[PDB]
Design a protein around this ligand. Structure first.
Ligand SMILES: O[C@@H]1[C@@H](O)[C@@H](O[C@@H]2CO[C@@H](O)[C@H](O)[C@H]2O)OC[C@H]1O
Ligand SMILES: O[C@@H]1[C@@H](O)[C@H](O)OC[C@H]1O
Length: 302
């Protein structure tokens, strides 16, 4: 655990949290990891326990052991939680993707959203209702949901989510929204304006922010551009930067700090060895679960 909590320092600027991710393995693999989470972060996103493949492996049959643990740990330690993720084309059981009937897919889709959201109703700050539904060029991704249900699945998803748990912030998450003018950023903005104008309850836009070294400085403008979509809020949801330089991290932290709609940042992992991009050392803590230079730099910028 670092002595100075960046989550604390960020919140002091009026932000909601600066968090990270977790699940049974990482929260138990050693003493430092959970100690770091408790000491320096204020929000948690289940790394994999809440995805479709892990919550509904077989039609209408749920398995909540893993998610229950993540949620319970967070709730027990005063950490906000971001559910992730309800609708996505990846980490999706074959039984779902094989469905060809629209009404059948809608029934299933709603049942999944409901059963999962209901189980943690009132304990979830924000849900990534939809995840990565855009092609890089701004058009809608042709996932089973899009091919079978069509564009109406967006409305069906958010509206169901909104009714099941009106206390959660409904989000649409996506990566590569890292620079103003990027096709995906424009596609996200234009679609969201359309949807919001149609009455679809979209409370925020989630920007993963999985960056390469040197892409930090361009994040501020992307955030500004996303702000034009018109959602109540926005947030950096799955942050990690190859090289984890202090410059990239401070830039990204400032990108959020100086944008009124950015409620918080969630770093996709605690220490390097546990990173899904470990080979790039893209996290704030190293192999020894010790603060890297970037962590201290972020702290001193706040
Ligand atoms: O295998 C897991 C990965 O899928 C990853 O989780 C994913 C990373 O990519 C993002 O698009 C998704 O939003 C996120 O949930 O990180 C954990 C790995 O173990
Ligand atoms: O432990 C579970 C809890 O996490 C969930 O919120 O409500 C149902 C319980 O069984």
């Amino acid at each position: 655990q670092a002595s100075v909590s960046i989550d604390a320092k960020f919140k002091a600027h009026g932000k909601k949290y600066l968090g990270t991710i977790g699940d049974q393995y990482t929260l138990t693999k050693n003493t430092k990891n959970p100690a770091i989470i408790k000491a320096d972060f204020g929000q948690l996103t289940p790394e994999n326990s809440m995805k479709w493949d892990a919550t509904e492996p077989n039609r209408g049959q749920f398995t909540f052991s893993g998610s229950d643990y993540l949620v319970n740990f967070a709730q027990s330690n005063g950490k906000l939680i971001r559910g992730h993720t309800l609708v996505w084309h990846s980490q999706l059981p074959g039984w779902v993707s094989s469905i060809t009937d629209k009404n059948t897919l809608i029934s299933v889709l709603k049942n999944h959203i409901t059963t999962v959201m209901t189980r943690y109703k009132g304990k979830i700050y924000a849900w990534d209702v939809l995840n990565e539904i855009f092609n890089e060029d701004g058009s809608l991704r042709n996932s089973v949901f899009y091919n079978v249900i069509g564009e109406d699945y967006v409305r069906i998803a958010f509206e169901t989510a909104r009714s099941v748990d009106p206390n959660a912030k409904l989000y649409i998450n996506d990566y590569n929204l890292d620079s103003a003018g990027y096709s995906k950023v424009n596609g996200m903005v234009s679609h969201v304006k359309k949807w919001l104008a149609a009455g679809i309850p979209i409370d925020g836009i989630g920007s993963q922010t999985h960056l390469g070294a040197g892409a930090g400085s361009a994040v501020a403008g992307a955030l500004n551009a996303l702000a034009s979509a018109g959602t109540k809020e926005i947030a950096i949801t799955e942050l990690d930067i190859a090289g984890a330089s202090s410059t990239d991290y401070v830039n990204v932290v400032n990108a959020c700090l100086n944008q009124a709609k950015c409620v918080g940042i969630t770093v996709w992992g605690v220490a390097d060895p546990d990173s899904w991009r470990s080979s790039s050392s893209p996290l704030l803590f190293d192999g020894n679960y010790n603060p890297k230079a970037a962590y201290n730099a972020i702290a001193n910028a706040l």
